[PDB]
Amino acid sequence: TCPFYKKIPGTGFTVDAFQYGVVEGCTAYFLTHFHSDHYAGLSKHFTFPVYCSEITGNLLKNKLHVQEQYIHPLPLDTECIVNGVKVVLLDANHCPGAVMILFYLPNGTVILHTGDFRADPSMERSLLADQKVHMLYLDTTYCSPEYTFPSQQEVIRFAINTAFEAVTLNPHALVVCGTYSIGKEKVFLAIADVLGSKVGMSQEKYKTLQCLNIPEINSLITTDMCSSLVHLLPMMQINFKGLQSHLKKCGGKYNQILAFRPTGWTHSNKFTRIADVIPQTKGNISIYGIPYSEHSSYLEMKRFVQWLKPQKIIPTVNVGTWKSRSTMEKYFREWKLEAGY
Numbered sequence: 001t002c003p004f005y006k007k008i009p010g011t012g013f014t015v016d017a018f019q020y021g022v023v024e025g026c027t028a029y030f031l032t033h034f035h036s037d038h039y040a041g042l043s044k045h046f047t048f049p050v051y052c053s054e055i056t057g058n059l060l061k062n063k064l065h066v067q068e069q070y071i072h073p074l075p076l077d078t079e080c081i082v083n084g085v086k087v088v089l090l091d092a093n094h095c096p097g098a099v100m101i102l103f104y105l106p107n108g109t110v111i112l113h114t115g116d117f118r119a120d121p122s123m124e125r126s127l128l129a130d131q132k133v134h135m136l137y138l139d140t141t142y143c144s145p146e147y148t149f150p151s152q153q154e155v156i157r158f159a160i161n162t163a164f165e166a167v168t169l170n171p172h173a174l175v176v177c178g179t180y181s182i183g184k185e186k187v188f189l190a191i192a193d194v195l196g197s198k199v200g201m202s203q204e205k206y207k208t209l210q211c212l213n214i215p216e217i218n219s220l221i222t223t224d225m226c227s228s229l230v231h232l233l234p235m236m237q238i239n240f241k242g243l244q245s246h247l248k249k250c251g252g253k254y255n256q257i258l259a260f261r262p263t264g265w266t267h268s269n270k271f272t273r274i275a276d277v278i279p280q281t282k283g284n285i286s287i288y289g290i291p292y293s294e295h296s297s298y299l300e301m302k303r304f305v306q307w308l309k310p311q312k313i314i315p316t317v318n319v320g321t322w323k324s325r326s327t328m329e330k331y332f333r334e335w336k337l338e339a340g341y
């Protein structure tokens with residue numbers, strides 16, 4: 001059974017609600033982004049209308065084999081009518097194709113559903129600026145003050161400089177980057193670009209990347225591993241055993257691996273600046289965990305919400321425990337009292 005926080009009152013709409021069977025009364029299923037906790041349940045046998053971005057639509061078609069007749073892609077930043085209700089999709093600054101949805105209810109209520117997002121001040125000049133929002137369905141992944149991490153730009157700067165130094169010192173080093181889903185593509189693309197290489201990967205990952213409308217992509221990625229000095233591997237293979245084994249396969253072309261594991265937040269963030277980050281090393285293998293986040297920090301989240309001044313907030317993450325829910329409600333009240341809405 002579908003939980004309440006995936007239902008849009010006064011509509012026949014649900015958001016990211018594919019794992020509950022047929023939801024009573026749902027005339028259109030919205031999908032915010034192509035990540036497995038959100039699409040869980042979709043397949044080629046799904047026969048209700050799905051509304052989503054162009055990029056999400058490419059992935060539904062090519063990776064999950066959803067039939068074209070049920071895929072309804074919408075352009076961003078454009079007022080659209082769906083089953084008699086005005087909607088707008090906005091960029092969520094999450095992974096490729098990820099959106100927030102603004103719903104304009106027939107009774108005059110306005111609802112913003114953020115999906116998953118990394119709040120940014122640039123959102124304060126989208127179509128959000130033009131009217132009041134009554135209810136906010138909020139990505140609360142990191143809704144606690146301990147969650148600090150650097151900007152995406154600082155993290156990429158660290159990775160580019162790290163990789164460029166290592167390979168200039170040793171032209172026979174291989175760079176490996178972990179992945180398990182879409183998002184965080186800037187990590188491996190930025191590193192390959194500074195090294196003048198394409199990125200090598202499996203046919204399945206290449207297929208996924210070809211759905212994402214990235215400019216000049218044919219110039220940046222390849223399935224030919226042997227022509228490339230930046231390789232992508234599944235995240236589970238980014239450990240001393242998995243990399244040792246991968247190095248065997250490269251046929252004495254390389255004598256050193258430097259590997260990156262983009263994580264979300266980790267507790268080493270409470271003590272250590274990005275500048276100061278060091279790898280785990282064994283032999284000729286080094287592994288850097290870098291805190292590249294596609295979710296709001298606490299401070300970014302707070303700033304967005306205090307700007308928006310919603311009348312009510314409904315969290316969509318960390319909703320399973322009483323202690324979590326109580327913690328989040330206390331922060332929402334502080335924010336409201338401090339800003340005065």
Ligand code: NI
Nearest residue numbers: 033035094116
């Ligand atoms: Ni996500």
